[PDB]
Amino acid sequence: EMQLTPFLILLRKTLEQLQEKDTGNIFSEPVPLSEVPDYLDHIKKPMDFFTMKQNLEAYRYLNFDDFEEDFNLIVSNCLKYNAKDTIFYRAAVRLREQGGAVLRQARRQAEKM
Numbered sequence: 001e002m003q004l005t006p007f008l009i010l011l012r013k014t015l016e017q018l019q020e021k022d023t024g025n026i027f028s029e030p031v032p033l034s035e036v037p038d039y040l041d042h043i044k045k046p047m048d049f050f051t052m053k054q055n056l057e058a059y060r061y062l063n064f065d066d067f068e069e070d071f072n073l074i075v076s077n078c079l080k081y082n083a084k085d086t087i088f089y090r091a092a093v094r095l096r097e098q099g100g101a102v103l104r105q106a107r108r109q110a111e112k113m
């Protein structure tokens, strides 16, 4: 199939590119549950870019689809929790659009391995 180290290098670069689309850094760290006490009533699996980085280095992403699944959780959790008329909801829509393009290019590079 493919070698581990170039794949992880690609995922590290891809995660950096996704974070660059989140210009407010609102997805950089976990949603603060102390300030959002009802969050887990709605959200089954919180996700954020710091957690994704930890998972990457813990060798928890060994195919592109598991990496993309967690990125999609960042977006979908935000759309689910927040009302449509909020900056947060719109930011997740924009991240879905801009990040989908980053992911398509990165997946093509993975398929070259």
Ligand SMILES: Cn1c(=O)c(=O)n(C)c2ccccc21
Residues within 6 Å of the ligand: 026, 027, 031, 032, 035, 036, 077, 078, 081, 082, 088
């Ligand atoms: C409730 N909440 C969210 O749903 C969210 O997506 N982000 C990014 C949040 C960021 C800070 C505080 C609360 C948040």
